[PDB]
UniProtKB/Swiss-Prot annotation, chains A, B, C, D, E, F:
GO molecular function: 3-cyanoalanine hydratase activity; cyanoalanine nitrilase activity; indole-3-acetonitrile nitrilase activity; nitrilase activity; nitrile hydratase activity
Compartments, record wording: Cell membrane
GO biological process terms on file: cyanide metabolic process; detoxification of nitrogen compound
Record protein name field: Bifunctional nitrilase/nitrile hydratase NIT4
Temperature profile: Optimum temperature for both activities is 40 degrees Celsius.
Pfam families: CN_hydrolase
UniProt domain CN hydrolase: residue ranges: 2-250
Length: 289, 289, 289, 289, 289, 289
């Protein structure tokens, strides 16, 4: 039996070493009640530009989109670097597992990735975003196949997905085949749609769906946590920003997969068959001796 | 622009020529307000045995399960036969499209299939059930791959699925690749779970999800109809049995697939790939000359 | 020795059977002076929405973007269909080679492709666009690798590329390895940049670069034709819309590849090496017997 | 923000310790206005024999080509030696970065290389020429793969290329993958061709293209400097020989890679892939103990 | 014991189907005295442009070099094609082994290759030239490593080399390690130098050196044949053009390798060691499925 | 410009302090005409036993081979000792460079080495023979790899080789990689073969080949000197024994390496590669402290 928390705070959107101590004080306030797993929302460190359009008509490209883009580009981080060593030292002080939604750069690009940290201050890996949704295609980049993680821990197996990757059927049945039972999912929207779209994943899976959204000033996001029977433990807190905690019974999965049981004993292999091509493909590959 | 109805009535569960005139009077009452498409619930003609256990412990097989099974077996139909000619003559009198959830027999077996009829009294085809859920495995049979239909009509393309086939990800992304925009789904359960599980399909698709459940005496089923933006047109009528009608705007799909757009321009073919084996496999195959 | 023409006219942007007779009267006026190859601009049949933004902020998705998208979606064509049979019958009447920049649909998507037709009314093939540039990612789709053509004719080998595919180095050195010497390139921009960017391709290649742009009311596009020595035959006509013709000496290529000579005898294979993966990848693949 | 200069002077073509004080007085005159980076043309120290043919018919080899070749061979330098110590002491006196186009010897051969020097009088490295163009194959040699530099400085990353290496697509997309943003390119030709061929590199890249050519008596070379938006800062000075200066805004690159963005987020790795073999290969390799 | 012939005739240098019947009448006149192996000189089919300079100063590139190059380019062949089928049918009529020095094209390039044919009309392979000498670098191309042949026959093992590949030490000790005992060597020069340079190869080897040169009007070439003891069988015929024949004793090799014996029992492997990298490297490599 | 001499005299074959004053009087007669470099033949001091067989059948070993071997063994020298101090004092009297072909002993063995002396009476080094030819294997020994010299002088770089080491290709391309331009080569044979075998080395190299042979009573050896263009300066003097002199133009090498140019810019490093293992290996190695 473990217990996990989600947060709902917002970033200051500029001056990225100043939005890193908010993470420290929230991590300490989430530490003082004996928690074990902390989930941060989407695009927490880099900042999520809401409402801005960058003045892109069809290819007009006015002068006041370029300066806006460089002011947004100068406030991103890069891995591994000085901004992940401090997070490793943050999670190294005591025992907690840490996920974090950051925005990284790689040679004048922007990838909306997510990070993973264990209780011993190691760096497990990262999961980039597969495809940005509608207008984020203009400013962000596409992830490859060699990124989808397993990340087995002594409290279970944890995975992640971002805003509208949870609507694909093929990515979810590729997560289910690796054995996910704690399924984190940050996002950046706030509708009645989202709770009804997460109840289906919590029923189709068997995993404790653990979402997180931010609250700024208005797009009042509501985070929650859902049992694998369809029972909301902690409700959709639209009432300001706060901390949300609940406990997780890991024996409520083998009693929940008695009815449905995806990629085992349903999902007839005699008619359906899937295959995922997972290659680290890169454009230019130097080879020396 | 079309308009479609669902019904919520129950069968008398025995004496199957007597439960066929209820269908006639409901079809006439659904005709008198200018409807165009009528959907009947799961296992309407054959009857759905609720609560019965047939006394199956592990293989004890007491004497009062066999007589119960033969009394249930003697009240099923077979296609094509005298019970589908009357339904073709029923839909042939005026202009309406007809789906129907029956229970067929094929050599001392039971298949929980669904039927399709056009406005001219023809027999389009049928869709058997892929896999029964938990206890229906004891009494019913498994469907093959060569059954999933397209069934293009001059009002659109209509498909179907049964109780817990709507939770598979692979079957839904096999329905989406054929171009479904009117997605009927009968069922035999009544929870808060079911409305939240259909909102996800109506959002992931772009299809007018049109469910149907029965009401008997208690398992008060609630049928509805959901827009492809996540807007319930007619609510979950738990208040007795009645008729439910709404209209369908077919221009609300090309404006709804601007955001998400499954198996087109999402669903990266460079990493994921699916293939469905659709063969008519049978055990014994006689060949003559 | 052949001679080829480019056009500079614009479409009426709506009611796509009405913009198809402008093509007929321009094709006849380009026929009456003994031409042999006619090139039409980018997005001629489907229409190129200039200046419109569809109101996409970050994911706000107001109501007046959806109706704008469906009014744009209802004015596209699909191949093969009734709109390419008329173009085949158009090019079948007399002897001319025909390229054409259309916009096709494939299941509520939009691909900005280009077509090819011979002198006998056959359908050679098509070349979809690899990646749309900045804001066209929101509304259009991505092409695959199994599309890049050779299309050998008895007047030479002709290829094509679209607006900002001509800036990639890898795609141009994949075109050069197949033996292109007549290199059509429609576009949708009008700067001093574009003439200086085509002179480099005409020098790096050895191919008669033959561009085409449209003129509407203002984005006064200028089409031209460039010798493989860097000598502009017909200038950048910014003076309204008109027809532009010149003749092509096919013996001015073997005398032009005496100096530079790309993928032969330059481009050291002992240090550089390229490989193109050209597979027809699709998401769902039905297989029967 | 840095500022850089190019020169346009010519050598005296013989007596190579006498053409080294012209470099001193030009370096001092370029020092007195607060410059930071000085670029010298192609083959400045060794001399570039223009118009001479050496009497090579097909292999006739008359007597008056051998004495001409030895008089040209006796006026070359060798690295490291007494001619680079004086250049290091020249750049060591004050703070300036120095590139220089020399001609080196290595055992009765001639390599047309280029040199690099920092502000502290160190020797960073050198970049030999990959392949000479047409007639220089008779007298010069070929470079290997283990020579292409990165050379990161505290004012950016600087690279180089020579006369007709800038027309290869593979070498430029091998320079782009290492992160070049100041792209020096000496040459030895003077056409209208060259400005139109450098505008394409400045647009395809994002780098401040900084060319240099010489002026002797006539082949009036014209050097320039081009912004990464396609805006010529200092024009093609055909009016005698002079000094040319401009300033460089390093924030005009992250605002310029918002549209195109080569080897990031364009250049689809799922279809194209490149690999460069970078080995120091030599004919005879002695090994001892 | 075999017997072999060399020829000394010249080509008409233009109209390449007319210089192919001279080969027929010489092949018949060499057939009528019971010969078994016929060797033709360097660049026999394509023609060897002697004395022409193409007006290449340093990169001036006057107009009367381009037309000269295209008139030379239009008189070359390509393998496999219609010009090697006739040579296979020529050698297929009776029993003779055939080598032939042609000039091939491969996409506006020129490779000075050599061909091989057996007694049954098959096509064994080809040997391109490794590096052209001084001025032929301007017009011809470089061969790769995956071309050096063995070509075992029932009369021995035959190899080949071209004009100044016979002066390299590494290529000859790569030929010796494969077991060459009949070593053909066409050329295009006529000095006292050449006989003294072939006596050394015939002594260092053990192979019957069998050279061939052409005679036109003056560069009076002289072909010969040398025993592996240093004994000229047929002298350097400077007296016009004619046929030259001699017989070959294959037992004069195992009695000749009693003294010297290269890559066996000399050539100390404890101090010297060689390795040849033999890879088929090409610039662009398409891969499909 | 230097000038060098070779001698052609013979030894008295016994009583080795008596054959050392012949060297003195020949060195003085070669001094009196202003020479600068004197070359002595193979096995001058120790004596070269011609025609003797030592009665070695297969291993019969008669008594009159042992006394013949000890009478030959008692007339050899050892380095460094009393016989090289007198030669150093001989070359120390005036300015001349001295090479000398001696026979040394090392613990009842015989090595056919060659010596080197400068103008100041120093001892530069020695070059033992790699492998004796046919019958000299019975009486002489094998040299190792750590012996091949460079020996740079202020008149150039001088090297050496002995009788049939000049036929190996690997040893000559190991001499060429160190920069030899004066290539001494004593021998002990007299054929027409030898002049034709040295013309190839003088052409393949660029070095003034300077051979020397002895004349006794008949094996009339003929020494010569060959320009690096293939022009014999002083002919093959078969007319008794005498002194042979000529002058050497060191500017006739950089004009001679314009055509061919071995281990530079020919000898493709991308396909061929050589490596020489140069270790001082000895059987028993005492180590103390």
């Amino acid at each position: 039996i473990v217990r996990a928390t989600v947060v709902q705070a917002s970033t200051v959107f500029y001056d990225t070493p100043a939005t890193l101590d908010k993470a420290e004080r929230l991590l300490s306030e989430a530490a003082e009640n004996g928690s074990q797993l902390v989930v941060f929302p989407e695009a927490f460190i880099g900042g999520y530009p809401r409402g801005s359009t960058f003045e892109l008509a069809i290819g007009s490209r006015t002068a006041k989109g370029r300066d806006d883009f460089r002011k947004y580009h100068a406030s991103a981080i890069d891995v591994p670097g000085p901004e992940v060593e401090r997070l490793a030292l943050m999670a190294k002080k005591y025992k907690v597992y840490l996920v974090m939604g950051v925005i990284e750069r790689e040679g004048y690009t922007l990838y909306c990735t997510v990070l993973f940290f264990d209780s011993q201050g190691l760096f497990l890996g990262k999961h980039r975003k597969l495809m940005p949704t509608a207008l984020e295609r203009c400013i962000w980049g596409f992830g490859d196949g060699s990124t989808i993680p397993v990340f087995d821990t002594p409290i279970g197996k944890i995975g992640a997905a971002i805003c509208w990757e949870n609507r694909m059927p093929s990515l979810r049945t590729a997560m289910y085949a690796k054995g996910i039972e704690i399924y984190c999912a940050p996002t950046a929207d706030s509708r009645e749609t989202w709770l009804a779209s997460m109840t289906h994943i919590a029923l189709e899976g068997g995993c404790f769906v653990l979402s997180a959204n931010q609250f700024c000033r208005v797009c009042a996001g509501g985070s929650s946590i859902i049992s694998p029977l369809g029972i909301v433990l902690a409700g959709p807190n639209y009432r300001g920003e706060a901390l949300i905690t609940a406990d997780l019974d890991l024996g409520d999965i083998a009693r929940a997969k008695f009815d449905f049981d995806v990629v085992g004993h349903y999902s007839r292999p005699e008619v359906f068959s899937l295959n995922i091509r997972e290659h680290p493909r890169k454009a230019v590959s130097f080879k020396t001796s």
